[PDB]
């Protein structure tokens, strides 16, 4: 459903766009990775997907501007209970909540929280770690049950075992996704064979998009194996 054609993206509308004539489309149900070095513009690419850059030219269809879930690079938590940080203006369902709590490894966090899910977190509350905050943001997105999910490098702030957790629960999130589109930007090559497509970024531009064989022709797939 998403169509982006020749799209141009900026960090600052006072200057020249950082990304020029970017064209890719995300049909519903696609699994799409976005990869590249730290600072190559992946977060900026997600901002372009959110319409937060300056479009010099081109066509963009996201279906949300017709008369969407988000995982930010830096986690944002409301000053509230952990429970309300999970619900994020939604009704409470406790199978969905149970699945989110288990899937986001939040039982050990709740177990060390003074009031479990009723522990006040965020500003003036319990000081969650950056990884716990990231897992909370992921759980909020999974709980929202949106048709489209944008995950910005979601395992950067988590451990290897937690990366395995995010692997296993993502693999049971896409299955949980009843045909839904899930876009997982990531900096890691560990699970890039296990999604459908990768977008490789460098210097604010897209260098290549394509298959494993395509990325062998890119002479990147071996580097990704490393």
PDB file of C-alpha atoms in Angstrom:
ATOM      1  CA  UNK A   1       0.000   0.000   0.000  1.00  0.00           C
ATOM      2  CA  UNK A   2       2.915   2.339   0.739  1.00  0.00           C
ATOM      3  CA  UNK A   3       4.333   3.976  -2.383  1.00  0.00           C
ATOM      4  CA  UNK A   4       7.382   6.257  -2.374  1.00  0.00           C
ATOM      5  CA  UNK A   5       8.716   7.528  -5.708  1.00  0.00           C
ATOM      6  CA  UNK A   6      11.836   9.683  -6.179  1.00  0.00           C
ATOM      7  CA  UNK A   7      11.728  11.027  -2.667  1.00  0.00           C
ATOM      8  CA  UNK A   8      14.117  13.618  -1.306  1.00  0.00           C
ATOM      9  CA  UNK A   9      14.917  14.011   2.389  1.00  0.00           C
ATOM     10  CA  UNK A  10      16.650  16.670   4.475  1.00  0.00           C
ATOM     11  CA  UNK A  11      17.954  17.122   7.979  1.00  0.00           C
ATOM     12  CA  UNK A  12      17.231  20.838   7.648  1.00  0.00           C
ATOM     13  CA  UNK A  13      14.909  22.554   5.132  1.00  0.00           C
ATOM     14  CA  UNK A  14      17.215  25.582   5.098  1.00  0.00           C
ATOM     15  CA  UNK A  15      19.774  23.454   3.237  1.00  0.00           C
ATOM     16  CA  UNK A  16      19.993  20.895   0.422  1.00  0.00           C
ATOM     17  CA  UNK A  17      18.328  17.515   1.132  1.00  0.00           C
ATOM     18  CA  UNK A  18      20.598  14.825   2.542  1.00  0.00           C
ATOM     19  CA  UNK A  19      18.776  12.161   0.513  1.00  0.00           C
ATOM     20  CA  UNK A  20      17.819  12.713  -3.119  1.00  0.00           C
ATOM     21  CA  UNK A  21      15.381  10.873  -5.408  1.00  0.00           C
ATOM     22  CA  UNK A  22      14.918   7.914  -3.054  1.00  0.00           C
ATOM     23  CA  UNK A  23      12.458   5.435  -4.548  1.00  0.00           C
ATOM     24  CA  UNK A  24      11.254   2.254  -2.855  1.00  0.00           C
ATOM     25  CA  UNK A  25       7.843   0.849  -2.008  1.00  0.00           C
ATOM     26  CA  UNK A  26       6.600  -1.153   0.955  1.00  0.00           C
ATOM     27  CA  UNK A  27       3.597  -3.371   0.051  1.00  0.00           C
ATOM     28  CA  UNK A  28       1.573  -4.565   3.038  1.00  0.00           C
ATOM     29  CA  UNK A  29       3.122  -7.711   4.467  1.00  0.00           C
ATOM     30  CA  UNK A  30       6.677  -6.959   3.354  1.00  0.00           C
ATOM     31  CA  UNK A  31       9.518  -7.465   5.835  1.00  0.00           C
ATOM     32  CA  UNK A  32      12.002  -4.690   5.083  1.00  0.00           C
ATOM     33  CA  UNK A  33      15.367  -4.145   6.698  1.00  0.00           C
ATOM     34  CA  UNK A  34      17.177  -0.813   6.570  1.00  0.00           C
ATOM     35  CA  UNK A  35      20.892  -1.034   7.245  1.00  0.00           C
ATOM     36  CA  UNK A  36      24.076   0.991   7.199  1.00  0.00           C
ATOM     37  CA  UNK A  37      26.774   2.529   9.391  1.00  0.00           C
ATOM     38  CA  UNK A  38      25.803   4.589  12.464  1.00  0.00           C
ATOM     39  CA  UNK A  39      24.892   8.079  11.297  1.00  0.00           C
ATOM     40  CA  UNK A  40      24.370   7.117   7.633  1.00  0.00           C
ATOM     41  CA  UNK A  41      20.846   8.517   7.828  1.00  0.00           C
ATOM     42  CA  UNK A  42      18.783   5.497   8.854  1.00  0.00           C
ATOM     43  CA  UNK A  43      17.003   7.513  11.537  1.00  0.00           C
ATOM     44  CA  UNK A  44      16.758  10.330   8.991  1.00  0.00           C
ATOM     45  CA  UNK A  45      15.325   7.795   6.530  1.00  0.00           C
ATOM     46  CA  UNK A  46      12.678   6.897   9.119  1.00  0.00           C
ATOM     47  CA  UNK A  47      11.977  10.614   9.565  1.00  0.00           C
ATOM     48  CA  UNK A  48      11.540  10.802   5.785  1.00  0.00           C
ATOM     49  CA  UNK A  49       9.083   7.926   6.127  1.00  0.00           C
ATOM     50  CA  UNK A  50       7.312  10.021   8.766  1.00  0.00           C
ATOM     51  CA  UNK A  51       7.301  13.106   6.536  1.00  0.00           C
ATOM     52  CA  UNK A  52       9.642  14.937   8.940  1.00  0.00           C
ATOM     53  CA  UNK A  53      12.201  15.880   6.278  1.00  0.00           C
ATOM     54  CA  UNK A  54      12.023  18.468   3.503  1.00  0.00           C
ATOM     55  CA  UNK A  55      10.767  16.858   0.296  1.00  0.00           C
ATOM     56  CA  UNK A  56      12.526  18.526  -2.622  1.00  0.00           C
ATOM     57  CA  UNK A  57      10.606  16.463  -5.186  1.00  0.00           C
ATOM     58  CA  UNK A  58       8.906  13.145  -5.776  1.00  0.00           C
ATOM     59  CA  UNK A  59       5.820  11.194  -4.796  1.00  0.00           C
ATOM     60  CA  UNK A  60       4.968   9.626  -1.454  1.00  0.00           C
ATOM     61  CA  UNK A  61       1.986   7.466  -0.442  1.00  0.00           C
ATOM     62  CA  UNK A  62       1.844   6.079   3.087  1.00  0.00           C
ATOM     63  CA  UNK A  63      -2.005   5.887   3.235  1.00  0.00           C
ATOM     64  CA  UNK A  64      -1.910   7.861   6.504  1.00  0.00           C
ATOM     65  CA  UNK A  65      -2.284  11.228   4.797  1.00  0.00           C
ATOM     66  CA  UNK A  66      -5.566  10.075   3.249  1.00  0.00           C
ATOM     67  CA  UNK A  67      -8.603  11.925   4.699  1.00  0.00           C
ATOM     68  CA  UNK A  68       0.832   3.540  11.967  1.00  0.00           C
ATOM     69  CA  UNK A  69       3.292   2.425  14.640  1.00  0.00           C
ATOM     70  CA  UNK A  70       6.632   3.974  15.495  1.00  0.00           C
ATOM     71  CA  UNK A  71       9.726   2.884  17.448  1.00  0.00           C
ATOM     72  CA  UNK A  72      12.040   5.846  17.910  1.00  0.00           C
ATOM     73  CA  UNK A  73      15.839   5.649  17.884  1.00  0.00           C
ATOM     74  CA  UNK A  74      15.798   7.235  21.346  1.00  0.00           C
ATOM     75  CA  UNK A  75      13.075   5.821  23.614  1.00  0.00           C
ATOM     76  CA  UNK A  76      10.307   8.057  24.907  1.00  0.00           C
ATOM     77  CA  UNK A  77       8.355   7.006  27.976  1.00  0.00           C
ATOM     78  CA  UNK A  78       5.477   8.754  29.653  1.00  0.00           C
ATOM     79  CA  UNK A  79       5.672   9.656  33.323  1.00  0.00           C
ATOM     80  CA  UNK A  80       3.150   7.030  34.393  1.00  0.00           C
ATOM     81  CA  UNK A  81       2.875   3.419  35.456  1.00  0.00           C
ATOM     82  CA  UNK A  82       4.681   0.781  33.397  1.00  0.00           C
ATOM     83  CA  UNK A  83       1.209  -0.571  32.558  1.00  0.00           C
ATOM     84  CA  UNK A  84       0.100   2.751  31.078  1.00  0.00           C
ATOM     85  CA  UNK A  85       3.453   3.026  29.304  1.00  0.00           C
ATOM     86  CA  UNK A  86       2.500  -0.290  27.678  1.00  0.00           C
ATOM     87  CA  UNK A  87      -1.166   0.495  26.942  1.00  0.00           C
ATOM     88  CA  UNK A  88      -0.376   3.917  25.383  1.00  0.00           C
ATOM     89  CA  UNK A  89      -3.997   5.153  25.168  1.00  0.00           C
ATOM     90  CA  UNK A  90      -5.681   1.822  24.423  1.00  0.00           C
ATOM     91  CA  UNK A  91      -8.031  -0.557  26.226  1.00  0.00           C
ATOM     92  CA  UNK A  92      -6.564  -3.233  28.454  1.00  0.00           C
ATOM     93  CA  UNK A  93      -6.647  -6.784  27.106  1.00  0.00           C
ATOM     94  CA  UNK A  94      -4.783  -9.209  29.334  1.00  0.00           C
ATOM     95  CA  UNK A  95      -3.937 -11.852  26.813  1.00  0.00           C
ATOM     96  CA  UNK A  96      -2.411  -9.159  24.630  1.00  0.00           C
ATOM     97  CA  UNK A  97      -0.759  -7.730  27.749  1.00  0.00           C
ATOM     98  CA  UNK A  98       0.427 -11.172  28.865  1.00  0.00           C
ATOM     99  CA  UNK A  99       1.887 -11.848  25.411  1.00  0.00           C
ATOM    100  CA  UNK A 100       3.529  -8.415  25.325  1.00  0.00           C
ATOM    101  CA  UNK A 101       4.967  -8.802  28.853  1.00  0.00           C
ATOM    102  CA  UNK A 102       6.377 -12.234  28.040  1.00  0.00           C
ATOM    103  CA  UNK A 103       7.504 -11.225  24.543  1.00  0.00           C
ATOM    104  CA  UNK A 104       9.258  -8.079  25.764  1.00  0.00           C
ATOM    105  CA  UNK A 105      10.941  -9.919  28.705  1.00  0.00           C
ATOM    106  CA  UNK A 106       9.174  -7.555  31.074  1.00  0.00           C
ATOM    107  CA  UNK A 107       8.408 -10.068  33.823  1.00  0.00           C
ATOM    108  CA  UNK A 108      11.974  -9.654  35.288  1.00  0.00           C
ATOM    109  CA  UNK A 109      11.564  -5.874  35.030  1.00  0.00           C
ATOM    110  CA  UNK A 110       8.153  -5.918  36.738  1.00  0.00           C
ATOM    111  CA  UNK A 111       9.582  -8.368  39.311  1.00  0.00           C
ATOM    112  CA  UNK A 112      12.180  -5.744  40.279  1.00  0.00           C
ATOM    113  CA  UNK A 113       9.648  -2.890  40.106  1.00  0.00           C
ATOM    114  CA  UNK A 114       8.226  -1.650  43.431  1.00  0.00           C
ATOM    115  CA  UNK A 115       4.600  -1.944  42.335  1.00  0.00           C
ATOM    116  CA  UNK A 116       4.999  -4.259  39.349  1.00  0.00           C
ATOM    117  CA  UNK A 117       3.196  -2.682  36.428  1.00  0.00           C
ATOM    118  CA  UNK A 118       1.820  -0.021  38.778  1.00  0.00           C
ATOM    119  CA  UNK A 119       5.351   1.284  39.395  1.00  0.00           C
ATOM    120  CA  UNK A 120       5.591   4.896  38.234  1.00  0.00           C
ATOM    121  CA  UNK A 121       8.262   5.132  35.540  1.00  0.00           C
ATOM    122  CA  UNK A 122       9.616   7.989  33.499  1.00  0.00           C
ATOM    123  CA  UNK A 123      10.242  11.425  34.978  1.00  0.00           C
ATOM    124  CA  UNK A 124      10.232  11.459  38.824  1.00  0.00           C
ATOM    125  CA  UNK A 125       9.624   7.691  38.878  1.00  0.00           C
ATOM    126  CA  UNK A 126      11.671   4.509  38.683  1.00  0.00           C
ATOM    127  CA  UNK A 127      14.734   5.035  36.488  1.00  0.00           C
ATOM    128  CA  UNK A 128      14.521   2.395  33.765  1.00  0.00           C
ATOM    129  CA  UNK A 129      17.645   1.508  31.822  1.00  0.00           C
ATOM    130  CA  UNK A 130      17.978   2.376  28.144  1.00  0.00           C
ATOM    131  CA  UNK A 131      17.459  -1.262  27.235  1.00  0.00           C
ATOM    132  CA  UNK A 132      14.382  -1.542  29.442  1.00  0.00           C
ATOM    133  CA  UNK A 133      13.096   1.692  27.876  1.00  0.00           C
ATOM    134  CA  UNK A 134      13.690   0.268  24.381  1.00  0.00           C
ATOM    135  CA  UNK A 135      11.882  -2.955  25.305  1.00  0.00           C
ATOM    136  CA  UNK A 136       9.015  -0.871  26.730  1.00  0.00           C
ATOM    137  CA  UNK A 137       8.781   1.068  23.448  1.00  0.00           C
ATOM    138  CA  UNK A 138       8.783  -2.194  21.485  1.00  0.00           C
ATOM    139  CA  UNK A 139       6.079  -3.599  23.777  1.00  0.00           C
ATOM    140  CA  UNK A 140       4.001  -0.436  23.298  1.00  0.00           C
ATOM    141  CA  UNK A 141       4.256  -0.829  19.518  1.00  0.00           C
ATOM    142  CA  UNK A 142       3.413  -4.546  19.614  1.00  0.00           C
ATOM    143  CA  UNK A 143       0.490  -3.865  21.966  1.00  0.00           C
ATOM    144  CA  UNK A 144      -0.905  -1.181  19.665  1.00  0.00           C
ATOM    145  CA  UNK A 145      -1.491  -3.919  17.006  1.00  0.00           C
ATOM    146  CA  UNK A 146      -1.061  -1.497  14.123  1.00  0.00           C
ATOM    147  CA  UNK A 147      -1.001  -2.535  10.493  1.00  0.00           C
ATOM    148  CA  UNK A 148       2.467  -1.046   9.941  1.00  0.00           C
ATOM    149  CA  UNK A 149       5.354  -1.115  12.427  1.00  0.00           C
ATOM    150  CA  UNK A 150       8.537   0.944  12.055  1.00  0.00           C
ATOM    151  CA  UNK A 151      11.338  -0.419  14.271  1.00  0.00           C
ATOM    152  CA  UNK A 152      14.536   1.687  14.362  1.00  0.00           C
ATOM    153  CA  UNK A 153      17.477  -0.608  15.293  1.00  0.00           C
ATOM    154  CA  UNK A 154      15.524  -2.298  18.094  1.00  0.00           C
ATOM    155  CA  UNK A 155      18.258  -4.595  19.472  1.00  0.00           C
ATOM    156  CA  UNK A 156      21.068  -2.018  19.709  1.00  0.00           C
ATOM    157  CA  UNK A 157      20.359  -1.378  23.388  1.00  0.00           C
ATOM    158  CA  UNK A 158      19.773  -5.049  24.247  1.00  0.00           C
ATOM    159  CA  UNK A 159      22.172  -7.880  25.112  1.00  0.00           C
ATOM    160  CA  UNK A 160      22.945 -10.907  22.926  1.00  0.00           C
ATOM    161  CA  UNK A 161      20.518 -13.067  24.913  1.00  0.00           C
ATOM    162  CA  UNK A 162      17.994 -10.251  24.699  1.00  0.00           C
ATOM    163  CA  UNK A 163      18.823 -10.018  20.973  1.00  0.00           C
ATOM    164  CA  UNK A 164      17.861 -13.700  20.798  1.00  0.00           C
ATOM    165  CA  UNK A 165      14.718 -12.724  22.708  1.00  0.00           C
ATOM    166  CA  UNK A 166      13.914  -9.962  20.203  1.00  0.00           C
ATOM    167  CA  UNK A 167      14.622 -12.483  17.421  1.00  0.00           C
ATOM    168  CA  UNK A 168      12.279 -15.117  18.848  1.00  0.00           C
ATOM    169  CA  UNK A 169       9.520 -12.709  19.786  1.00  0.00           C
ATOM    170  CA  UNK A 170       9.796 -10.879  16.465  1.00  0.00           C
ATOM    171  CA  UNK A 171       9.472 -14.226  14.700  1.00  0.00           C
ATOM    172  CA  UNK A 172       6.291 -14.680  16.774  1.00  0.00           C
ATOM    173  CA  UNK A 173       5.224 -11.095  16.030  1.00  0.00           C
ATOM    174  CA  UNK A 174       5.333 -11.465  12.283  1.00  0.00           C
ATOM    175  CA  UNK A 175       3.331 -14.644  12.753  1.00  0.00           C
ATOM    176  CA  UNK A 176       1.182 -12.617  15.153  1.00  0.00           C
ATOM    177  CA  UNK A 177       0.962 -10.052  12.347  1.00  0.00           C
ATOM    178  CA  UNK A 178      -2.078 -11.287  10.425  1.00  0.00           C
ATOM    179  CA  UNK A 179      -0.529 -10.376   7.033  1.00  0.00           C
ATOM    180  CA  UNK A 180       0.547  -6.976   8.466  1.00  0.00           C
ATOM    181  CA  UNK A 181       3.554  -5.043   7.192  1.00  0.00           C
ATOM    182  CA  UNK A 182       6.477  -4.975   9.611  1.00  0.00           C
ATOM    183  CA  UNK A 183       9.476  -2.760   8.817  1.00  0.00           C
ATOM    184  CA  UNK A 184      12.536  -3.425  10.983  1.00  0.00           C
ATOM    185  CA  UNK A 185      15.410  -1.033  10.405  1.00  0.00           C
ATOM    186  CA  UNK A 186      18.506  -2.599  11.909  1.00  0.00           C
ATOM    187  CA  UNK A 187      22.233  -2.088  12.211  1.00  0.00           C
ATOM    188  CA  UNK A 188      22.955  -5.808  12.635  1.00  0.00           C
ATOM    189  CA  UNK A 189      23.533  -8.421   9.951  1.00  0.00           C
ATOM    190  CA  UNK A 190      22.716 -11.275  12.348  1.00  0.00           C
ATOM    191  CA  UNK A 191      19.095 -11.643  11.242  1.00  0.00           C
ATOM    192  CA  UNK A 192      19.235 -10.004   7.811  1.00  0.00           C
ATOM    193  CA  UNK A 193      18.950 -13.434   6.059  1.00  0.00           C
ATOM    194  CA  UNK A 194      15.715 -13.993   8.000  1.00  0.00           C
ATOM    195  CA  UNK A 195      13.833 -10.942   6.723  1.00  0.00           C
ATOM    196  CA  UNK A 196      12.750 -10.321   3.157  1.00  0.00           C
ATOM    197  CA  UNK A 197      14.694  -7.258   1.992  1.00  0.00           C
ATOM    198  CA  UNK A 198      17.544  -5.043   3.145  1.00  0.00           C
ATOM    199  CA  UNK A 199      18.125  -1.386   2.324  1.00  0.00           C
ATOM    200  CA  UNK A 200      21.784  -0.442   2.691  1.00  0.00           C
ATOM    201  CA  UNK A 201      22.508   3.209   3.439  1.00  0.00           C
ATOM    202  CA  UNK A 202      25.695   5.246   3.382  1.00  0.00           C
ATOM    203  CA  UNK A 203      26.309   9.022   3.553  1.00  0.00           C
ATOM    204  CA  UNK A 204      22.608   9.921   3.543  1.00  0.00           C
ATOM    205  CA  UNK A 205      21.979   7.942   0.349  1.00  0.00           C
ATOM    206  CA  UNK A 206      20.732   4.456  -0.426  1.00  0.00           C
ATOM    207  CA  UNK A 207      23.611   2.437  -1.821  1.00  0.00           C
ATOM    208  CA  UNK A 208      21.726  -0.724  -2.811  1.00  0.00           C
ATOM    209  CA  UNK A 209      18.561  -2.698  -2.120  1.00  0.00           C
ATOM    210  CA  UNK A 210      18.321  -6.337  -3.054  1.00  0.00           C
ATOM    211  CA  UNK A 211      18.669 -10.044  -2.347  1.00  0.00           C
ATOM    212  CA  UNK A 212      21.530 -11.915  -0.700  1.00  0.00           C
ATOM    213  CA  UNK A 213      22.790 -12.785  -4.200  1.00  0.00           C
ATOM    214  CA  UNK A 214      22.358  -9.113  -5.134  1.00  0.00           C
ATOM    215  CA  UNK A 215      24.413  -8.208  -2.054  1.00  0.00           C
ATOM    216  CA  UNK A 216      27.045 -10.740  -3.036  1.00  0.00           C
ATOM    217  CA  UNK A 217      27.196  -8.792  -6.310  1.00  0.00           C
ATOM    218  CA  UNK A 218      27.359  -5.667  -4.105  1.00  0.00           C
ATOM    219  CA  UNK A 219      30.353  -7.397  -2.398  1.00  0.00           C
ATOM    220  CA  UNK A 220      28.670  -6.695   0.937  1.00  0.00           C
ATOM    221  CA  UNK A 221      27.063 -10.070   1.733  1.00  0.00           C
ATOM    222  CA  UNK A 222      30.455 -11.525   2.687  1.00  0.00           C
ATOM    223  CA  UNK A 223      31.047  -8.489   4.908  1.00  0.00           C
ATOM    224  CA  UNK A 224      27.575  -9.061   6.366  1.00  0.00           C
ATOM    225  CA  UNK A 225      28.562 -12.684   7.057  1.00  0.00           C
ATOM    226  CA  UNK A 226      31.539 -11.244   8.948  1.00  0.00           C
TER     227      UNK A 226
END
